[PDB]
Amino acid sequence: ICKPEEVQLGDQCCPPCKQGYRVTGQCTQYTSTTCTLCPSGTYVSGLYQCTQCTECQDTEVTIRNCTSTQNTVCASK
């Protein structure tokens, strides 16, 4: 089992990435995790993916804006 400050990447316990970053390289027992910046207009979706921030259409209002970790939230007016 991994410690709470770590994250399971393969069957390997690794340091996590900071909020705006996805895992670009897995750690080993002896080496670091590599993280890359998710670019503006994207959010960290899994450990490894930047997903494009969805746009709330004209027939909707934005409840919460797109952060680096979570998608936009939309509801009807």
Binding site: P15, P16, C17, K18, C27, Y30, T31, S32, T36, L37
Partner: protein
């Protein structure tokens, strides 16, 4: 060449309060030397070490970024991570645990 920090998972050091100490982040880099910073874990949060004395010691095939304890104090007990910034990349080391005796 990937930038790598060679701190082994569950790495630890036993050190004496009042003695000086040098905590090493061994860095592999091939071109421009990255910006590296130390931080100390409280739970699952790495508080950056901003006011602290740090230095580089360069060797043929690896380089050491050192966190200086001048001297070690009982409150220095705990877990430390080291981080490197290269362009848009962020390389995150395993935590190394300091055990202090006094």
């Amino acid at each position: 060449c990937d930038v790598q920090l060679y701190i082994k998972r569950q790495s630890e050091h036993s050190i004496l309060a009042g003695d000086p100490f040098e905590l090493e982040c061994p860095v592999k880099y091939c071109a421009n030397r990255p910006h590296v910073t130390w931080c100390k874990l409280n739970g699952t949060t790495c508080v950056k070490l901003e006011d602290r004395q740090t230095s580089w010691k360069e060797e043929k095939n690896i380089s050491f970024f050192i966190l200086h304890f001048e001297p070690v104090l009982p409150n220095d007990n705990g877990s430390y991570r080291c981080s490197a910034n290269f362009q848009s990349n962020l390389i995150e080391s395993h935590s190394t645990t300091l055990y202090v005796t006094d």
